[PDB]
């Protein structure tokens, strides 16, 4: 018909992109980082344990002050802990017990939840009365919500299982922009440090970078074999690490449209559940399904330490804004903080 | 540190109050059974209780049945959430499209071998049983056509027939049950079990069957905790 060409021409565009992409690759970080000494042995110990949840904990996030963090479990409770004192501050009940994502506003005034109910709930913590109450209930998606992130106290970027991410305005309560283009479910999304662009992984072995200001798609990085479970930008904002269900994490640099390193080991056989860089970006923590999360080296690709402690698969992995501590949550209803 | 003593102490009253509420509602959380209800499609899953919740109660026991009819077809991602559910209710329509039975069998196998829905039992409802009581008598889509092994199948000796039911029907329905039992017993059965049933025209019996199977699952889990079976 009149579309066969589309393929022929689209496939030759892809071939040209790969060919031009190949000409850029002439070296790898493995040789460049040989001169720099390896990180060495890292012995992280659980400083705190937060045993307050009933069911498995499936999401978590850190506050901008790196002191109190919210966690979501499928028991229908959203708990705002206090890492320093391990004292709960707010135990918000939820309507839908099947929560899959959570977020804490940068200003610390609002919290975000969402899950299989295809609805993103936004709760206000600084209410005049003094009790946490529902503030907004965004509902414009068809599939489930996998991850939501606050840009400010007015707009929020939410991924969905319908293969479309959305930019919602809390003040109005409707989608401002829709970042369509993905084929499979969108599992995780990360915002850039400057809150101008963000990346999102999907269940088609593809990570797409968008621009909230413009609302279009600018790059598409491929190279994983299966669906991507989590991603996050490098602290500098010019690179991001994505872990897949192939027990492999990869680092991509947006400026060169390509992958830079792969952290794969023979012993590890299960997919990655979460990934997060350190404050300086040297380390790359990544949760696994082996009930333990490894501490990879961003330039050596060698396990510089393994953080076990959990007896079930780890679902959330966060690093404080100042990098002092690291929080890990698992399907065992426990949060461990590793300083 | 004068203000520290009278501020941090006030920060423990809130913690104690939250602990009290969590302890209070843990009871209600642990005593209510949760049940996922999924089906291939056009099976009539609304006939059990009668888009996301259906709370019911039998013999002073609460059941929360969670439907998932407002999602898309790719269950390989959002199905991992229902791993702690007590039992996954799977309603298969025994009735274009294709060998809907083959698709149901494939979905059941995938659920049985998911590596996450491993400790979760599966109640199975072969719905539209009476619906195929006429197809076999006609032969529009006779089972042997879509299942060569059916042409040599023998009805089980212990298979209780429905009073006044064409053997052919009884035979086809027991053959399907088998396809499912073989699929379920091919893998390890030491951590979860499959409970097959035939849906009837009355809903007062389906709820009782679900309650009985949930009690059986709880008892088996308790026995396994003590290493008795």
């Amino acid at each position: 018909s009149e579309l066969d060409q589309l393929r022929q021409e689209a496939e030759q565009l892809k071939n040209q992109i790969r060919d031009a992409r190949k000409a850029c690759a002439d070296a790898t970080l493995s040789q460049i980082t040989n001169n720099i000494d390896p990180v060495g042995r890292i012995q992280m110990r659980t400083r705190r344990t937060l045993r307050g949840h009933l069911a498995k904990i499936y999401a978590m996030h850190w506050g901008t002050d790196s002191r109190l963090l919210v966690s979501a479990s499928q028991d229908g409770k959203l708990i705002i802990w206090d890492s320093y004192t391990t004292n709960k501050v707010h135990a918000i009940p939820l309507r839908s017990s099947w929560v899959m994502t959570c977020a804490y506003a940068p200003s610390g005034n609002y919290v975000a939840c969402g899950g299989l109910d295809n609805i993103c709930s936004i709760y206000n913590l600084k209410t005049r009365e003094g009790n946490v109450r529902v503030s907004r209930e965004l509902a414009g998606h068809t599939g489930y919500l996998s991850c939501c992130r606050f840009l400010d106290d007015n707009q929020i970027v939410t991924s969905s299982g319908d293969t479309t991410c959305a930019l919602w305005d809390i003040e109005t309560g409707q989608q401002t922009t829709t970042f369509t283009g993905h084929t499979g479910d969108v599992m995780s999304l990360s915002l850039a440090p400057d809150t101008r662009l963000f990346v999102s992984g999907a269940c088609d072995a593809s990570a797409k970078l968008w621009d909230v200001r413009e609302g279009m798609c600018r790059q598409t990085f491929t190279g994983h074999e299966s669906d991507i479970n989590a991603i996050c930008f490098f602290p500098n904002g010019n690179a991001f690490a994505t872990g897949s269900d192939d027990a492999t994490c990869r680092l991509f640099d947006l400026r060169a449209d390509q992958e830079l390193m792969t952290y794969s080991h023979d012993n590890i056989i299960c997919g990655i559940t979460s990934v997060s860089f350190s404050k300086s970006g040297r380390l790359l923590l990544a949760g696994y399904d082996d009930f333990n999360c490894n501490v990879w080296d961003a330039l050596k690709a060698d396990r510089a330490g393994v953080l076990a402690g959990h007896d079930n698969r780890v679902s959330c992995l966060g690093v404080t804004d100042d990098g002092m501590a690291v929080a890990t949550g698992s399907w065992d209803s426990f949060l461990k903080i590793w300083n | 540190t004068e203000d520290q003593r009278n501020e941090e102490k006030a920060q423990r009253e809130a913690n104690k109050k939250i602990e009290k509420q969590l302890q209070k509602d843990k009871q209600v959380y642990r005593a209510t059974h949760r049940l996922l209800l999924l089906g291939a499609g056009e099976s009539g899953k609304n006939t059990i209780v009668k888009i996301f919740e259906t709370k019911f109660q039998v013999d002073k026991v609460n059941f929360h049945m969670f439907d998932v009819g407002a999602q898309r077809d790719e269950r390989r991602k959002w199905i991992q959430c229902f791993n702690d559910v007590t039992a996954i209710i799977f309603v298969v329509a025994s009735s274009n499209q294709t060998n809907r039975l083959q698709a149901a069998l494939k979905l059941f196998d995938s659920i049985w071998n998911n590596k996450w829905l491993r400790d979760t039992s599966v109640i199975l409802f072969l719905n539209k049983q009476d619906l195929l009581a006429e197809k076999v008598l006609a032969g529009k889509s006779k089972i042997e056509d879509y299942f060569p092994e059916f042409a040599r199948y023998t009805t089980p000796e212990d298979a209780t027939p429905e009073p006044g039911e064409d053997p052919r029907v009884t035979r086809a329905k027991y053959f399907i049950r088998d396809e499912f039992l073989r699929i379920s017993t091919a893998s390890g059965d030491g951590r979860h079990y499959c409970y097959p049933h035939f849906t009837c025209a009355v809903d007062t019996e389906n709820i009782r069957r679900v309650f009985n199977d949930c009690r059986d699952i709880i008892q088996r889990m308790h026995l396994r905790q003590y290493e008795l079976l």
Partner: nanobody
Amino acid sequence: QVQLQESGGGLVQPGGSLRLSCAASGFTFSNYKMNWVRQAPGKGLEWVSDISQSGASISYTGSVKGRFTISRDNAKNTLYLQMNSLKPEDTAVYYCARCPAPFTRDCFDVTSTTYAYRGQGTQVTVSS
């Protein structure tokens, strides 16, 4: 980039034989269980066959049981389906699918158009 191409197939008469090939480039072929489904004109996707990573565990749909053979060549990273004794109701598009997760004994691939890890497919028909 996961890429699943299909070679072979096309048109035939009642009872012919074609060796359809599925070539994979972008994943470790040996670590994935690979299925192969068919979609008739006017109907949805129906699973038609599968094969394990090693090639031992083989499953067949009842409709074409005993008329089709399926195998995998890990060394050549290919999946070979020998189709025989064709039948009039075998006219459809055959899609080579790959199970989504490595080292898994179950997968969910007969979904709608929305399935990234499936080949573009080929339309093969059989008539007079």
